[PDB]
Amino acid sequence: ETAFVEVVLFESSPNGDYKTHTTELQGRFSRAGATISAEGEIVQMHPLGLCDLYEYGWVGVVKLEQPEMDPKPCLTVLGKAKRAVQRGATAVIFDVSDNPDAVEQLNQGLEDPLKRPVVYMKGMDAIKLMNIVNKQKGARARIQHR
C-alpha cells in the first residue's frame, strides 16, 4: 500500500508552547514491514550503523548507498530493518534512491513480516525528507495509512 508520511519541524515558544511546520511526503509500506500507522523521533541511521542507546519507539531513516559501495554487506537491508526494531525503532524509513534492488529484498515476503512499518521511499520525497532531516536537532515522523 501507500504511506502518507508527515514530517514535523517543531520549535518551542519561550513560555512553553510549541509551533510547527509539517510536511507531507509519500512512500510505500513494504511486504516485510507491517502496514500500520506510527510516530516517533527520527534518528538518522548510517546504513553501516546497523552492524549508543536510544529511547524506545523512534523512527529510523537510513539512506541506502550505491550498491558497489558495500559489496559484502554486514546485513541484508531486511536484516538492517529487523535489527533496528530489536534496537527499538517503532518504525523504519529507507531511502532507496541509490539502490532500487532494496525493493526486491524488502518485498520478498518469505519470512514472517515484521510487526512494524518498514517503509521505503525514493525520488523526490526522499529528497524533501533528507532536506529536512539534516536541518534541525529533533524531528517527529507521523506515519499514517489513511
**Binding of residue 52 to its own copies (CB under 8 A):** yes
Nearest-angstrom CA–CA distance, 85 and 56 = 10
Binding at 57: pick from Br ion, its own copies, none (beta carbon under 5-8 Å per type) = its own copies
24 near its own copies, judged by CB under 8 A: no
CB 88 within 8 A of CB 95: no
Express the helix, strand and coil content of the chain in percent, nearest 5 each. 25, 35, 40
| Type of residue found at 71 | P
Q: Report yes or no: 30 and 2 within 8 Å, Cβ to Cβ.
A: no
Binding residue for its own copies (CB under 8 A) from 31, 49, 57, 103? 57
Q: Residue 53 interacts with its own copies (CB under 8 A)?
A: yes
Q: Which of residues 93-112 bind its own copies (CB under 8 A)?
A: none
Residues binding its own copies (CB under 8 A): 8, 10, 12, 15-18, 36-41, 52-53, 55-57, 86-88, 90, 138, 140, 142-146
